[PDB]
Amino acid sequence: KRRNTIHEFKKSAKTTLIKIDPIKTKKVNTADQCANRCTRNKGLPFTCKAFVFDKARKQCLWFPFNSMSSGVKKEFGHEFDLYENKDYIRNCIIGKGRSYKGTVSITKSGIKCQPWSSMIPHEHSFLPSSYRGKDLQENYCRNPRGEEGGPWCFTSNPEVRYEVCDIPQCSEVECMTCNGESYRGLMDHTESGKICQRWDHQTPHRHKFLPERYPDKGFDDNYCRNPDGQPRPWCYTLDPHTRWEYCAIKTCADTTECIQGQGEGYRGTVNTIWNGIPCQRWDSQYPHEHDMTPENFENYCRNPDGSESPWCFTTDPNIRVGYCSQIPNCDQDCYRGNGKNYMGNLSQTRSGLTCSMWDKNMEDLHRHIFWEPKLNENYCRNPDDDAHGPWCYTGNPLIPWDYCPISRCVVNGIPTRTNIGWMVSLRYRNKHICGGSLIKESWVLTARQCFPSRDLKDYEAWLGIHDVHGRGDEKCKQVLNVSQLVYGPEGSDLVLMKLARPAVLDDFVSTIDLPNYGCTIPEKTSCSVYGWGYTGLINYDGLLRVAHLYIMGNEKCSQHHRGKVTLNESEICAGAEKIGSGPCEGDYGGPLVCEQHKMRMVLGVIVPGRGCAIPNRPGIFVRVAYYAKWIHKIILT
Amino acid sequence: CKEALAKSEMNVNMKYQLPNFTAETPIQNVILHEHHIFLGATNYIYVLNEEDLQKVAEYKTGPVLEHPDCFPCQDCSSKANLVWKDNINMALVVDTYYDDQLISCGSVNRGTCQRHVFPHNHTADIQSEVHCIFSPQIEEPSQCPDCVVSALGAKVLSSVKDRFINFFVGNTINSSYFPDHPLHSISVRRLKETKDGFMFLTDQSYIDVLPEFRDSYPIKYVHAFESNNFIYFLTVQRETLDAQTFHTRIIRFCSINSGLHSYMEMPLECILTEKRKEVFNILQAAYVSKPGAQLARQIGASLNDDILFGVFAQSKPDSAEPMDRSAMCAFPIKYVNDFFNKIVNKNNVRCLQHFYGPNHEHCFNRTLLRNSSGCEARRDEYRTEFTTALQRVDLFMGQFSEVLLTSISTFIKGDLTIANLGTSEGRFMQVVVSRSGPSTPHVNFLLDSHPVSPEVIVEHTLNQNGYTLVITGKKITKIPLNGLGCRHFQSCSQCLSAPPFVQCGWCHDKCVRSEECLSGTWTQQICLPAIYKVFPNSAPLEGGTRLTICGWDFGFRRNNKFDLKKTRVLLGNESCTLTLSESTMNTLKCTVFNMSIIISNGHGTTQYSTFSY
């Protein structure tokens, strides 16, 4: 016939055994039929103590030795999987002790069980030749006939022919807890001496558990488990006719209100459901008998099954399960913009970093800031009444201070005649992505909508070019590496880039001043913008292109928007002279700069929104004055 | 007798002329915008009057000619030869953030879409503007960005983030059609200002399964939405790369223009459980909505916290088809949020199968900062696949356990939540949902032979003027959410059990609205016993043979229950015998010169004068 015995094999994952001092592979689809061949009598002349298969190989290689055999090197090879003969690993007695292989030749009276090849002194030694496949060891006692009594070894003693070996029944160590699901041992026999099938297998029962799908429960080769929370662990039967069976195990040796988790480990005195109906006790099967018994693990609403809510049988006969769902489970500002107005018991920044210690923080504050002469340490409340809300100092040497998160209440391109050093050509993937404006010898600004990747070792700054790629002026261009990005306050969407090295100034390269922090604009005031971005023209030579705009109030802006937006002070609105011309793709982060009387400074930044350069429609820009002091307080870095 | 009195039930069939509109072709999607119903359909697109249900206008993406030489939008009219295929509108969305636009999509044109703009003077004409979202990729012809619409599966989610239009699209794809056009499972197509193409912000902006599995492991997408910056998805796929079963999953991730950073999938199962088990693999339709006040307590939220509703049907063995057995399931977003974040241990959480492949560097020795990380964008994202599911008790307890449910919508009224179930075959019901008890369908009638589409539109202006739009086959219907009528009710019990927002009251003869009682006998409060028959009609003062009493409204009405203790039965002066085990609100049993027989039920009484000595 053709039978299965891999179920009697063990397995291990992603290891291959290399016996340095020695065993053949034949391409066979089924590692399981492979193990069955290894077991099946006379299959190979050598002593197939285990097997290994690699489904990448699909080559079937029996190994006539254990890993406990000396000198064999395991190797973490994913494709290779071992399958051990659990009999050599039993080291105990199952039933008759019929199939033993363990290396023990000690009698019950502590005598060495003779070499079974030794005719001396006792006659019946010829067995290993006679009984081949029983692993009739050199000296170690085996159960030659599958005798009830077990391995009985012909003692070397002159007086006694054989003394029976004694090996414990395996369950001596296979104990259990009342839950039993925690226990994950070797005992792979049912309560009727039946054997559990391999949990990876789908035959003869294709049950629900896929050990990889439900790992962490020890659904290893055949080992009894409690997956469904029975008082006893149980397994699906190797026999197709038995659906499944319990596993015989002995026992082992040696509450509050607020809810944790789904209440499973949690325990409760309360057993009134949201309907108010009290629930009855575990003994009291009434009104309708319940399976759960104290043997499984008062009249309380516990979670023995670990349901979403602990559940107790309504004394109402109609309802089987009632949910005591009133149970409690253990589980920001408005119009106050200055930090002192709120006491923030919060230790985090907006970056997610924790706070720092308010002592050195306080000292550095007083040193840097003498604005005025309270709060707790390491907490969201901030003294300096900062407009962008509550903040906290940070332990980072790169960044010392960050806000803590509490909510409170160019189309028609006209090219530039000459060069502007304020512009910065951001090259990611080695080409311009957005405009940036230089303020310090070591600081540029642009918008947060301009940045795919979070690193720096991709990005690049290009400096002092009138054409897109330094195509004309290879004499004066210069490229810099990126040291840091800084993300602005909430809803700011303003990112400040420091380069790896400040770029020493020159005629061509120009930094820009900041607007007056509290300043207000005059309406229609002409200003200018510069970009290499999309303009709609047939052929962009790569030149910088300049356009002029004129300030305007909220009115006409929302009017052309027809109420698309209700403005905010963050926003600055400026518009064209009834013509279709405005920033578009590739211009983002471009500057709009203006002068008080002659000295010109940035006032807005190109930000993408709501369509490109629709004629007679105003654009919305950032209020640089709305952030200038924050930019300074960070320029402290 | 019980079947003889089957007239007790409200009739399943009651035909009504509804606001109805017929389609030449099967309907694929629907959009509501400015009192106008835009609906894509087989090779076509239509507009409807919101009140008039009248085709204001329409346009044809009609019989589609395909040429292998042809690009989606390059002209191929002059061509003399070829496939003669048919675009089905798989993706459809109106956008307002830039302009008043409709983004429509063809299935066949390499899955490449178009746009149609609306004038202000008249705001319904679409034949004006046709524009192809077809950005030529001179840079990297590796990836066709505007090739968006998959043929096999399209779930589209449009939003405005960081002042840009973003499309999160989930796509079912076969491995075979990959070389013909390379596409992605889940991709984030961001729409350029110039509105002439989409741009992939990076390489990690797109996710799709390893080229090996793309024959097996079919993952098809069924729903998505936005809430709390987590753009969840509902979709079915294999339990495992080997399982060949299917379990419906919910996916969560954060929305940064770049791409899906913290990508999480969790299994979701709905179980109908009893004392001392049926699990629905396959979600059929869903709807995320606010809860009714009674539901807010019963499941644990406010009137504003968002609850996701999933109508799940049990799957055929090793197959994603349903076993015609469905229920519905509620999921507070708070609970799923916390399950993703904190509840799960550190041993469970796995790496994605279909993306990483089991044999990898990262899956071997990589972990999470679960309690120390939520929505954090780290440049090395970890695709996490929780092994422990979230499972819900059916709120219905199988009040439809014998049937499949094609679709669902949700709405609430006052304190209650009422679900507008669509039946597998197309028997639209409206049913109050509560943990209390089963609610009968105050409407149940059969709409049409064909399945009800999961495409369903809900609206309640002022919570007074309200309606849903429902698709089936080639017709859409505007069903007011305000009920239809009380007359079909055929018991005082059934009449009273109706919701208040339908005005139900027995007019001494049948349930009715108050004003229609000419006799003014309109009552909603006392349920008089009604006799159908008596078996037999001849009895002695001592001789006793079984006494079968057919009728209705016999039991005392408690809010749900109908109690037979609260009843007395008299034979004139002599009280007739009550066999409560054999006596129910439908039928009664007794054991004992013309005489009448008086029932005294929970509310009223009656006499029956067909009896003698």
Author numbering:
A (entry chain A): 34 to 55, 59 to 290, 302 to 344, 351 to 384, 389 to 430, 434 to 469, 495 to 722
B (entry chain B): 26 to 107, 111 to 304, 311 to 626, 634 to 654
Text from the published report:
HGF, the ligand of c-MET, is secreted as a single chain 83 kDa precursor protein containing an N-terminal (N) domain, four consecutive kringle (K1–K4) domains, and a serine protease homology (SPH) domain.
In one-half of the holo-complex, N, K2, K3, K4, and SPH domains of HGF I are arranged as a C-clamp shape that packs tightly against the SEMA domain of c-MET I. Totally four interfaces are formed between c-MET I and HGF I (denoted as interfaces I, II, III, and IV). Interface I is formed between a short α-helix in the linker connecting the fifth and sixth blades of c-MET I-SEMA and two short inter-strand loops in the N domain of HGF I. Interface II is made between the fourth blade of c-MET SEMA and the K2 domain of HGF I. Three positively charged residues in the loop of HGF I-K2, Arg242, Lys244, and Arg249, interact with negatively charged residues of c-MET, including Glu267 and Asp352; while residues 249–252 of HGF I-K2 make close contact with a surface formed by strands E and F of the fourth blade of c-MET I-SEMA. Interface III is between the SEMA domain of c-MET I and the K3 domain of HGF I. Furthermore, a long loop (residues 300–311) that links the fourth and fifth blades of c-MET I-SEMA adopts an extended conformation, is tethered to the K3 domain of HGF I, which largely contributes to the binding between c-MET I-SEMA and HGF I-K3. Interface IV is mainly formed between the second and third blades of β-propeller in the SEMA domain of c-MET I and SPH domain of HGF I. To confirm that interface IV is essential for c-MET activation, we introduced Y673A mutation into HGF to disrupt this interface, and showed that HGF Y673 mutant has a great deficiency in binding to c-MET as well as promoting c-MET activation.
